[PDB]
RNA sequence: AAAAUUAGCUC
């Protein structure tokens, strides 16, 4: 009944990966939702969230 | 219906590289000799390392790799030794290989620099490049660590692995002026003149020449230090001649058998 | 894990022939020579020498597949001049030329050193 | 302020000093909507058409918008956003020295590169990301061209001589965890060599390879399906010991033995493997130009410039136009300049002082074409190439997707217990799934015999 | 330290050579 | 048992015989991560003992 | 026995969208450990040699082996029934190579001709008469390429850069631009080959070859084309670079002038809208018509800039060569790289106002200017301003999201479609029926 | 069961490996490795021929 | 700009308009046809149709 | 390792470059991903259309 | 007669540990200890 | 982690030059001058001394004993 | 005194000071 | 001859 993936294994494959993983976010919206507003890069994310780095799969 | 009479002229002879020019020969022969320089040149090198105790911070195989890449002077030994594959004995016999030993252990407080100078060779002439300019750094040891091993070196050629690649870099170049148009410059003015260019500074490239064959090949063979440059060239010519002789003998036997 | 060893590029395997002659059927006086464990080094020079020869109507080699160590040289001469003797003459004259080049290079070096 | 701060690390001056002095200020996203931000101080304030002339703040440096993985991308603005994102995601898969004290860690699946050189062109932002101290790639002489054809659809041609000299040569570790415990009143595990007599349950593998203590000694050759720990559980004994996964073929680095919280014998063993770069290995630049090594040629075969400089990688030219990664070309050019001059160059995203014309002018002062193109020669025949190839240094990475970890096959392997069908997964030695879409495709082909064979004969025959 | 002084000298030289700046590959926005 | 190839192209390598037969034998090479099937007569036992034990 | 050379396997790629996704192949064992396949067969599978995976099944019965060899095979599966056109075509560097190989100004010496002939599996063994005997025997690229074409094919096609106003005027049968591909008796005579003649398009040369000659003949055609064009590509050479990305220093002036004109026009439009002069266009509100006019102005500016950039290129340029050969790219790509990127639309509109009545904090409120709503005025060669960089990232994100949702939905659509007609078939009564023997069509496709 | 083990199953004699270009091979050929070839097998009936 | 041969479109239309009424391609349209339980369960409503 | 010199870090089989900030459970590096949600104590006025309400003042 | 020598974790001092014994160093007393290199013929090829 | 033994591209020996390069950089020379002072003409061999990172020091910091 | 033009260098000193005082993972 | 669950990455 609770959330999943809140605590992940730190991917120690390279220092860049370690930094990225230690400084990551994750939205609680359901996986693979039909809507497309929350996924789009909103304007307010200027200088707060990298506009380039992000997965390319379903998430 | 026969071969040609190529001529040779050396422009710069040193103990590190040779710049020569070959005239009146075919581009195919030129390029083949180049590829022989790089690939099929006998030379000695480390190829069988037995590590007995390695407490360094690097992997076990790392030491073997670095030792494999250390050049060994073979000015007069390579022509005498025989390929280990064709030897007619067991174990690396000195007649067909050269033995090395390395035993260092950092005792004092300051960090050691295990250099190629530690490779104590049994033979006098087969030694790393330190006769006459630091020495090839192998690994660094700290107080408490040690490295004990012994290796055998054998004869091979670059085609098998890079370790047998005597030449550092061959500079091959013919027809400095783009006379044969084998390359088409979109904007000739924008390109710099070749080192061997006889063309003045006004004209960008020589005029076209329909009935013109490539000649005057310029070579800048640069020895890594193992073999002398001219020695590399002589060995390459002899090896190519031997390959052609063997091919001719095989063909004669085949025709006779048919 | 399946990487081939490095000695398979030049060393012959037991039973493999270094050179094999195969007569072609499409045109008269045409043969394909197949060479095992070689590369462009030993084919391009032969091709150029055959081209130099005038009695050779056609001459040319190829590498059936880069990972495979094999080359095919096709030769076709006039009806009065067999490709076997064409090949033999090309190799002979190429060897003579290489020997002469070596001799000239050696004399040039020995003169360059303090001369 | 700039002076007092430039003299930091000697006396005591730090960011807190500015914050207290009142020169910087933290604005949160909810307040940022009510401030007239400005990009650069000088440019947007001198005197021009009255745009706003009421700025309240001013950003430190625009490139600071980028994140962690993005920042290491040189010239990100010279590339299409999808390729920037692809590079961002791929960077986390790059090999290299992931941590200095790696020889003490016993983590699972640790890769380490031999010669992790530093990028010839580093952005000013990575100086703080720490990338230069722990790089994840090597600067290779990349020549963008189609030499033979084996590098046509997003593939590369590497130099066999380079690999022989140790080009992108890395190492693959695999750790193992195993400890004894009291299964039951009569059941009990213990480390001991399972002999051929007392142990009933036993594998058809070599056991004498390890010592009497039951732990394979370091620096011992191992191969697939070999015993690594001599665990035996008393029922006389059953060989409940683990084996090295199939197709691993490694060497044991070190063996660690200790006591877990419960107080039982707990041991870890890691095996290393020297992964020589072979074809099928996936490489990628810092611009999203992924690919897999197609074929490897020797130096004698690779092309070469007017001097003996043979390219180390050859990407497909056609990958450039469709993807619009001009940043990669700019990187290559500035890398050539940096190599010739003798010092690392700058690639900060927004610099206003790094254009292509100035870089080209600099490059022209070393006897090289101002655009970086050079004349190569056909490695085989030695005839010049009509087209002037574009060859220069460029920073390339190596991903962990080795071929040997993905290759798989099967021929009547183990079967499940519930439904008598092959297993799933390379590690468990299973078979591939013949999906419903494959079934539909076969129906379309009308090969009913083949369909029934795939679904019945080689799946689960039963009467 | 040498890099810091190199950067400072480069900056002062760039400020000094302010004769003309006519380059094709560069641009900037100008609203209103 | 540990063996050593005394003849043939692989002369000089060291490996442990994995599967043996009447004529041929599979030996895993120590250095390379590949197992080859070399003739038994090409092998020569070297063994690895520990004299002393006191 | 172990799988040996010549055996028949069925190579497949995991997403099997259509019939041309599982074709049989003949086995060939090679040293290194990687599945290999000719590039031409890449297009059907949609593979990319960028770390992809492709399954490989093997039958266990002479019956099934013969069945696959006769029904599902590459040469037999060259033309698809979905669009009755070839699926396997030259869509890689070989395409650009052959295009440059078939230009009027291509000449080869006896050595090169005899070297290229070796890579021909159907050569009759006779050297063709050179197109130019004196002063020196020179062959022509078209003359050599003719021998590659099998049988006696006849077809007509038009090259990519074929001016429309040429057939009407004189020179119809002799084109200065060497266009109007004409093949008679399977001998190229005119024109330059490109995707229009060799690619996957109705009536393409490969299509004609397959229809007239046999499937094995078409297979040999493909193999010879690749094996000769690639080998000649060694002598020719293809590449790309900054030198192929730079303009002539006058096109830059033209582009800057055009961009300034567009900016002025949009500013004037904004002034009129502010002062209440722009009347509502029919069928749209005032804001809608204002947006439409601005978008049309910007698109016109972008098109003009791109046209100028294109007309300012040189024949030696590589972007243009690849685009005209159609191997990979397009004119819009060159336009973006050199001239200007363009508008960064999202959700089919301009960048919205995320903040209160403005895009980003930097720009002021009520700034409908081009750069303040996403118009990227710079070009990929000259870097991007941070604001337009952010907007470009937004556009890329939109594209990625659309791709992901499509990949999620199209599969379900296809599944339902396939499950609704999985039993329909053409019985021997020459009629289409389903499992219940209900007649759906008295003849397949009427 | 229906979609998991009747319409889609797991079959033997399968392989899955990375792919690379190889223009020297015909469109109908496939360059399988040596390991997979040796691992798989084809049942062939004996015959005096 | 893509092209699809008219035969396939015609076949789909006929299959959707064979029973007089517009049978939906969904589970609510194909399972109503008297094809067979073993055929309906494959598409959907596996336990229900059985 | 709070404010501990690189000397001690090296001597303790650790590197000064490790960012840290990751727990160790069962000998595994576990990292907490920063979740996001709607700000509390702020009035939002949405205009959900797929319902009977024209406007909704969520808080 | 091999008592299975081990190496202490931090002491780097040899210890003799036999079966059915606690895993600890002869001095100080720690719970970590590694093994010693095998005595086999570790022969690599410098390739 | 350690300076290589040979330039990947060219093949010239470069391992025996890291110490000399550091010394020349320390005394007075700059990089662009030190490289050609050591004798690295081709730009392919200069990346060995410019890009190379020296991690063996951090490795040695973890002395096993004493 | 204001810092005209000579600002590219001074713009990164503040960044260096910030990253020195607060680490990359300071928020955690 | 070993379970159930979750997560991450790739086309
Ligand atoms: Mg792909
Ligand atoms: Zn001997
Ligand atoms: Zn103790
Ligand atoms: Zn170099």
TrEMBL record, chain G:
Subcellular location: Chromosome; Cytoplasm; Nucleus
Residues holding Mg(2+): 48, 50, 52
Recorded family membership: Belongs to the RNA polymerase beta' chain family.
Role, per record: DNA-dependent RNA polymerase catalyzes the transcription of DNA into RNA using the four ribonucleoside triphosphates as substrates. RNA-dependent RNA polymerase that catalyzes the extension of a non-coding RNA (ncRNA) at the 3'-end using the four ribonucleoside triphosphates as substrates. An internal ncRNA sequence near the 3'-end serves as a template in a single-round Pol II-mediated RNA polymerization reaction. May decrease the stability of ncRNAs that repress Pol II-mediated gene transcription.
Protein name: DNA-directed RNA polymerase subunit
Species the sequence originates in: Sus scrofa (Pig)
Location of this fragment in the whole protein: 448 to 893 of 1984
From TrEMBL, chain I:
Transmembrane regions: none
Protein localization: Chromosome; Cytoplasm; Nucleus
Function of the molecule: DNA-dependent RNA polymerase catalyzes the transcription of DNA into RNA using the four ribonucleoside triphosphates as substrates. RNA-dependent RNA polymerase that catalyzes the extension of a non-coding RNA (ncRNA) at the 3'-end using the four ribonucleoside triphosphates as substrates. An internal ncRNA sequence near the 3'-end serves as a template in a single-round Pol II-mediated RNA polymerization reaction. May decrease the stability of ncRNAs that repress Pol II-mediated gene transcription.
Family: Belongs to the RNA polymerase beta' chain family.
Protein name: DNA-directed RNA polymerase subunit
Species name: Sus scrofa
TrEMBL record, chain K:
Positions annotated to bind Zn(2+) 3: 25
Residue positions binding Zn(2+) 1: 8, 11, 25, 27-28
Protein residues bound to Zn(2+) 2: 11, 25
Binding site residues for Zn(2+) 5: 27
Subcellular location: Nucleus, Nucleolus
Binding site for Zn(2+) 4: 25, 27
One Gene Ontology cellular component annotation held by this UniProt entry: RNA polymerase III complex
Subcellular location, principal: nucleus
GO biological process: transcription by RNA polymerase II
GO molecular function list: DNA binding; DNA-directed RNA polymerase activity; zinc ion binding
Keywords assigned by UniProt, alphabetized: DNA-directed RNA polymerase, Metal-binding, Nucleus, Transcription, Zinc, Zinc-finger
Disulfide bond residue pairs: 8-25, 8-28, 11-28, 25-28
Binding site for Zn(2+) 6: 30
Family stated for the protein in its record: Belongs to the archaeal Rpo12/eukaryotic RPC10 RNA polymerase subunit family.
Function field: DNA-dependent RNA polymerase catalyzes the transcription of DNA into RNA using the four ribonucleoside triphosphates as substrates. Common component of RNA polymerases I, II and III which synthesize ribosomal RNA precursors, mRNA precursors and many functional non-coding RNAs, and a small RNAs, such as 5S rRNA and tRNAs, respectively.
Annotated protein name in UniProt: DNA-directed RNA polymerases I, II, and III subunit RPABC4
Organism field: Sus scrofa
Gene designation: POLR2K
Automatic annotation (TrEMBL), chain M:
Localization (cell): Nucleus
Signal peptide span: none
Function: RNA-dependent RNA polymerase that catalyzes the extension of a non-coding RNA (ncRNA) at the 3'-end using the four ribonucleoside triphosphates as substrates. An internal ncRNA sequence near the 3'-end serves as a template in a single-round Pol II-mediated RNA polymerization reaction. May decrease the stability of ncRNAs that repress Pol II-mediated gene transcription. DNA-dependent RNA polymerase catalyzes the transcription of DNA into RNA using the four ribonucleoside triphosphates as substrates.
Family designation: Belongs to the RNA polymerase beta chain family.
Protein known as: DNA-directed RNA polymerase subunit beta
């Amino acid at each position: 009944q609770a959330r999943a993936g809140v605590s992940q294994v730190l991917n120690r494959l390279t220092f860049a990966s370690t930094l990225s993983h230690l400084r990551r976010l994750n939205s609680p919206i359901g996986r693979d939702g039909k809507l497309a507003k929350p996924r789009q890069l909103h304007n307010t994310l200027w200088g707060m969230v990298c506009p380039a780095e992000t997965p390319e799969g379903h998430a | 219906p026969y071969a040609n009479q190529p001529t040779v002229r050396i422009t710069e002879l040193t103990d590190e590289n040779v710049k020569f020019i070959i005239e009146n020969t075919d581009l195919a022969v030129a390029n083949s000799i180049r590829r022989v320089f790089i690939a099929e040149v006998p030379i000695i090198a480390i190829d069988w390392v037995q590590i007995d105790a390695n407490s360094s911070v690097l992997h076990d195989e790392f030491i073997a790799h670095r030792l494999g890449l250390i050049p060994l002077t073979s000015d007069d030994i390579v022509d005498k030794l025989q390929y280990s594959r064709d030897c007619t004995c067991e174990e690396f016999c000195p007649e067909c290989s050269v033995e090395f030993t390395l035993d260092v252990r950092c005792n004092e407080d300051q960090t050691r620099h295990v250099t190629s100078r530690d490779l104590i060779s049994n033979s006098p002439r087969v030694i790393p490049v330190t006769s006459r300019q630091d020495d090839i750094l192998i690994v660094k040891l700290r107080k408490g660590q040690e490295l004990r091993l012994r290796a055998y070196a054998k004869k091979g050629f670059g085609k098998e692995h890079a370790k047998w690649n005597p030449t550092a870099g061959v500079a091959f170049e013919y027809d400095p002026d783009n006379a044969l148009r084998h390359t088409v410059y979109p904007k000739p003015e924008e390109w710099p003149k070749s080192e061997y260019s006889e063309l003045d500074e006004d004209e960008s490239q020589a005029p076209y020449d329909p009935n013109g064959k490539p000649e005057r090949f310029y070579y800048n063979v640069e020895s890594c230090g193992s073999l002398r440059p001219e020695t590399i060239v002589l060995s390459a010519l002899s090896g190519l001649k031997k390959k052609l002789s063997d091919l001719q003998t095989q063909l004669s036997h085949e025709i006779q058998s048919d | 894990m399946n990487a081939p060893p490095a000695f398979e590029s030049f060393l012959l395997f037991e039973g493999e022939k270094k050179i094999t002659i195969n007569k072609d059927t499409k045109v008269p006086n045409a043969c394909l020579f197949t060479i095992n464990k070689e590369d462009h080094t030993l084919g391009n020079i032969i091709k150029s020498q055959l081209l130099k020869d005038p009695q050779v109507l056609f001459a040319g080699y190829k590498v059936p597949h880069p990972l495979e160590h094999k080359i095919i040289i096709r030769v076709q001469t006039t009806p009065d001049y067999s490709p076997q003797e064409a090949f033999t003459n090309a190799i002979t004259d190429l060897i003579s030329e290489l020997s002469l080049l070596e001799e000239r290079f050696r004399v040039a070096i020995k003169d360059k050193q303090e001369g | 302020h700039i002076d007092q701060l430039k003299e930091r690390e000697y006396n005591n001056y730090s960011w807190q000093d500015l914050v207290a002095s009142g020169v910087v200020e933290y604005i949160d996203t909810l307040e940022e909507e009510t401030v007239m931000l400005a990009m650069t101080p000088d440019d947007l304030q001198e005197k021009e058409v009255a745009y706003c002339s009421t700025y309240t703040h001013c950003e430190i440096h625009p490139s600071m918008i980028l994140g962690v993985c993005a920042s290491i991308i040189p010239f990100p603005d010279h590339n299409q956003s999808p390729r920037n994102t692809y590079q961002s995601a791929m960077g986390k898969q790059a090999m290299g020295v992931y941590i200095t004290n790696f020889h003490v860690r016993m983590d699972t699946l640790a890769h380490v590169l031999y010669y992790p050189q530093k990028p010839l062109v580093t952005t000013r932002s990575m100086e703080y990301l720490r990338f230069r101290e722990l790089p994840a790639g090597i600067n290779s002489i990349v020549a963008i061209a189609s030499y033979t054809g084996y590098n046509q659809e997003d593939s590369v041609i590497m130099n066999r001589s380079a690999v022989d000299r140790g080009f992108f040569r890395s190492v693959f570790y695999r750790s193992y965890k195993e400890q004894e415990s009291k299964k039951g009143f009569d059941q009990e595990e213990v480390f001991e060599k399972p002999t051929r007599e007392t142990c009933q349950g036993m594998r058809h593998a070599i056991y004498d390879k390890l010592d009497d203590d039951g732990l394979i000694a370091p620096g011992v050759r191992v191969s697939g399906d070999d015993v690594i720990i001599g665990k035996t559980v008393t029922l006389t004994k059953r060989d409940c010991s683990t084996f090295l996964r199939t197709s691993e073929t490694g060497i044991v680095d070190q063996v660690m033995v200790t006591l877990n919280q419960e107080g039982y014998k707990f041991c870890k063993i890691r095996v290393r493997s020297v992964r020589i770069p072979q074809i099928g290995d996936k490489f990628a630049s810092r611009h999203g130009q992924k690919g897999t090594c197609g074929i490897q040629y020797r130096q004698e075969d690779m092309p070469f410039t007017c001097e003996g400089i043979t390219p180390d990688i050859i990407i497909n030219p056609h990958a450039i136009p469709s993807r619009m990664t001009i940043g990669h070309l700019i990187e290559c050019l500035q890398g050539k300049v940096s190599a010739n001059k003798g010092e690392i160059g700058d690639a900060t995203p927004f610099n206003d002082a790094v254009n292509v014309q100035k870089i080209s002018n600099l490059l022209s002062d070393y006897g090289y074409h101002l655009r970086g193109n050079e004349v190569l020669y056909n490695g085989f025949t030695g005839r010049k190439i009509t087209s002037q190839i574009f060859i220069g240094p460029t920073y390339y990475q190596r991903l962990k997707h080795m071929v040997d970890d993905k290759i798989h096959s099967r021929a009547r392997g183990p079967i499940q217990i519930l439904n008598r069908q092959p297993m799933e997964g390379r590690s468990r030695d299973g078979g591939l799934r013949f999906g419903e879409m494959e079934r539909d495709c076969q129906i379309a082909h009308g090969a009913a015999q083949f369909l029934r064979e795939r679904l019945f004969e080689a799946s689960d025959p039963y009467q | 330290e040498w890099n810091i002084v190199e950067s400072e000298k480069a900056l002062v030289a760039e400020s000094h050579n302010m004769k003309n700046q006519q380059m094709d590959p560069f641009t900037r926005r100008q609203c209103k | 048992q540990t063996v050593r190839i005394s003849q043939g192209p692989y002369k000089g390598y060291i490996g442990v015989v994995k599967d043996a037969t009447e004529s041929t034998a599979r030996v895993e090479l120590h250095s390379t991560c590949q197992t080859i099937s070399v003739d038994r007569q090409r092998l020569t036992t070297v063994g690895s003992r520990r004299p002393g034990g006191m | 026995r172990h799988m040996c050379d010549g055996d028949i396997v069925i190579f497949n790629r995991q997403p099997t969208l259509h019939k041309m996704s599982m074709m049989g192949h003949r086995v060939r064992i090679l040293p290194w450990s990687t599945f290999r396949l000719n590039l031409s067969v890449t297009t059907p599978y949609n593979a990319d040699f960028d770390g992809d995976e492709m399954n490989l099944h093997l039958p266990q019965s002479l019956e099934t082996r013969a069945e696959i060899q006769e029904l599902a095979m590459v040469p037999r599966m060259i033309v698809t029934p979905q669009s009755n056109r070839p699926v396997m075509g030259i869509v890689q560097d070989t395409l650009t190579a052959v295009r440059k190989f078939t230009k009027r100004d291509v000449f080869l010496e006896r050595g090169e001709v005899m070297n290229l002939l070796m890579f021909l599996s159907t050569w009759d063994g006779k050297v063709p008469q050179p197109a130019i005997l004196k002063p020196r025997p020179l062959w022509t690229g078209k003359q050599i390429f003719s021998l590659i074409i099998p049988g006696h094919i006849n077809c007509i096609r038009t090259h990519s850069t074929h001016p429309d106003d040429e057939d009407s005027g004189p020179y119809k049968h002799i084109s200065p631009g060497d266009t109007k591909v004409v093949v008679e008796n399977g001998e190229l005579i005119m024109g330059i080959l490109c995707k229009k003649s060799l690619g996957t398009s109705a009536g393409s040369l490969v299509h004609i070859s397959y229809l007239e000659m046999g499937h094995d003949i078409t297979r040999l055609f493909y193999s010879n084309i690749q094996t000769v064009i690639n080998n000649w590509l060694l002598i020719e050479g293809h590449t790309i670079g900054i030198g192929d990305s730079i303009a002539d220093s006058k096109t830059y002036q033209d582009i800057q002038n055009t961009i300034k004109k567009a900016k002025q026009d949009v500013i004037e439009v904004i002034e009129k809208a502010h002062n209440n002069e722009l009347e509502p266009t029919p069928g749209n509100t005032l804001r809608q018509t204002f947006e439409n006019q601005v978008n049309r102005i910007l698109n016109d500016a972008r098109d003009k800039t791109g046209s100028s950039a294109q007309k300012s290129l040189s024949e030696y340029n590589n972007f243009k060569s690849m685009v005209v050969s159609g191997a990979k790219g397009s004119k819009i790509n060159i336009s973006q790289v050199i001239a200007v990127v363009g508008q960064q639309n999202v959700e089919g509109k301009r960048i919205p106002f995320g903040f209160k009545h403005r895009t980003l904090p930097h720009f002021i409120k009520d700034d409908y200017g081009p750069e303040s709503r996403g118009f990227v005025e710079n070009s990929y060669l000259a870097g991007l301003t941070p604001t337009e960089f952010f907007f470009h990232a937004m556009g890329g994100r939109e594209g990625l999201i659309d791709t992901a949702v499509k990949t999620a939905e199209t599969g379900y659509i296809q599944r339902r479609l396939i499950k609704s007609m999985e039993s329909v078939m053409v019985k021997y009564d020459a009629t289409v029926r389903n499992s219940i023997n209900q007649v759906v069509q008295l003849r397949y496709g009427e | 069961r229906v979609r998991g083990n009747l319409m889609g199953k797991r079959v033997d004699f399968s392989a899955r490996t990375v792919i690379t270009p190889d223009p020297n091979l015909s469109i109908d050929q496939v360059g399988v490795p040596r390991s997979i070839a040796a691992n798989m097998t084809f049942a062939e009936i004996v015959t005096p021929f | 700009g893509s092209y699809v041969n008219y035969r396939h479109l015609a076949l789909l239309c006929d299959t959707m308009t064979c029973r007089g009424h517009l049978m939906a391609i969904t589970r609510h349209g194909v399972n109503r046809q008297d094809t067979g339980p073993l055929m309906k369960c494959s598409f959907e409503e596996t336990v229900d149709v059985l | 390792l709070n404010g501990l010199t690189d000397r001690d870090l090296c001597e303790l089989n650790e590197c000064p470059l490790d960012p840290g900030g990751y727990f160790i459970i069962n000998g595994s590096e576990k990292v907490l991903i920063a979740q996001e949600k709607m700000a509390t104590n702020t009035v939002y006025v949405f205009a959900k259309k797929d319902s009977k309400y024209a406007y909704t003042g969520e808080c | 007669q091999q008592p299975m020598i081990y190496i202490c974790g931090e002491c780097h001092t040899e210890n003799e540990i036999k079966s059915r014994d606690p895993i600890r160093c002869r001095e100080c007393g720690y719970r970590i200890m590694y093994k010693k290199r095998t005595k086999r013929l570790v022969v690599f090829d410098a390739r | 982690m350690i300076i290589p033994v040979r330039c990947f591209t060219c093949g010239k020996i470069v391992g025996n030059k890291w110490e000399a390069y550091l010394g020349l950089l320390q005394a007075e020379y700059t990089e662009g001058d030190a490289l050609d002072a050591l004798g690295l003409k081709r730009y392919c061999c200069r990346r060995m001394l410019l890009a190379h990172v020296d991690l063996i020091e951090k490795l040695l910091n973890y002395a096993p004993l004493e | 005194e204001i810092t005209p033009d000579l600002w590219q260098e001074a713009c990164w000193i503040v960044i260096s000071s910030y990253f020195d005082e607060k680490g990359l993972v300071r928020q955690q």
